Each structure stands twice: as structure tokens, then as C-alpha cells.
């Protein structure tokens, strides 16, 4: 809780920095982008310093539950399944899943059904993984890091990547060989995850988000 954060002198924020425009590693090795700046605002308003801890996305809730981080600010969708294990702030971004393919491939899937019979790369433990995993006949290939999922697609070892719309746009801008084939397939909102007992921290973060909006 806040007493504990004040006592070490800094907020510990967990994320996976493979997710522009929310968090990524720049060419100097620094972790930057929207969530980083959100983290900084929260810390400044709390009156403490900030430490970002980059890890695998699917390790973030494990890290939060074991108190190795205070909060997750990592483009994380608020889900009923996750609301069983953690608390979320008010939402701060709307997105949904899309399908990315190679422009040179002779296919342009529009729906999850269109990926039946195809090999689809996802980042493990994302809402994208969760969705494609429900469809029998999609062969899912799962990666800790989105960079590796895109390398799989570029190299032709997968047919498609499924991931959130804003990040899909960022990866396709970097990779003119790739294209978003589908419209948006889900209605998701991002929130900041806090341990359920840390009601003080949740409240404070909600107040910061409200002032920002
Ligand atoms: N920093 C990241 N890699 N974030 C992945 C988030 C994907 C999706 N919004 C989810 O919550 O599962």
C-alpha cells in the first residue's frame, strides 16, 4: 500500500516493454511511451520516485501478487477473469484485437473463423492468446515477447499475429511487409492493476486518472 511505497521511496511499476505506443525500449535502451509517462505522473503526485520493472507480460500478475511490484501499467485489458485475482482502475484506453498478416500472403482474414487451419502467433497470456485459444483448428504458437511473434510471422513460420489494434498499428508502421487484415474484433479497455487489498493505492490512482481526463 502507499505507506509501503513511501517507506522505500519509490513506486514499483511492472510492464512488458514490447508494446508501443504504451511501452517500448528506445534506441538508447530506455523504456518509454504512454504508460511510462502515466507511471511518472502517478509517482510525481504520490511524491515518490519511480522504478519500472520490465518482465514477461504473463509474469506481471504473478509479480504483483507476490508484492515484487506495486502496480501493473502495461496496456492491460480489464477482464472478468483477471478481476478474480486483482483490482483495476478506471479504464484509460479503448482497443480491440486485430489480425496482422504478410502483405505478400494471398490471404486477408477478417474474423477468427478465417484463421481456422492457420498458424497464429500470439503473446502468451494476452487477451489475443485467450481468444484464439478458444477456436478449434487455429494452431496457436505462443511467445513471451511480441518481437518474437512478429519475427515468426515475418519469417513465414506463422500465418498471422493477433494483437491489440493500437499496437498492431505500431508494429505495421515499423514493418511495411505487414498489414492489418481485419477490422477490430473485440471491445477492450485498459486499466491499471493493483492488489485487491491495496484499496488506498487504487483510489489514489483513480483520482490521478480523473484529473488527467
Ligand atoms: N505490454 C504488453 N505486452 N501488453 C499486452 C497487452 C495485451 C492485451 N491488452 C492484454 O491485456 O492481454
Numbering used by the authors: 20 to 232
Task: Give sentences from the paper.
Among others, the arginine binding protein isolated from Thermotoga maritima (TmArgBP) contains one helix insertion motif, with Gly52 in the C0 position. The structural effects associated with the replacements of Gly residues adopting conformations forbidden to other residues were here evaluated using TmArgBP as model system. The Gly52 residue, which occupies the C0 position of the motif and presents a well-defined electron density in the crystal structures of TmArgBP variants, adopts a conformation that is strictly forbidden to non-Gly residues.
The TmArgBP20-233_G52A crystals contain one molecule in the asymmetric unit and, as expected, the protein presents an arginine molecule in the active site. Indeed, the root mean square deviation (RMSD) value computed on the Cα atoms between TmArgBP20-233_G52A and TmArgBP20-233 is as low as 0.29 Å, although the crystals used to solve these structures were not isomorphous. Determination of Ala52 main chain dihedral angle values (φ = 117.3°, ψ = −170.9°) indicates that Ala52 assumes a conformation closely similar to that of Gly52 in TmArgBP structures. This conformation falls in the ε region of the Ramachandran plot, and is considered to be strictly forbidden to non-Gly residues. Moreover, as in the parent protein, the carbonyl-oxygen of Ala52 forms an H-bond with the nitrogen of Asp56. Since it has been shown that backbone geometry may show a significant level of variability, the local valence bond geometry and deviations from planarity of the peptide bond have been compared with values detected in well refined protein structures. This analysis unravels the occurrence of significant deviations from average values for both peptide planarity and bond angles.
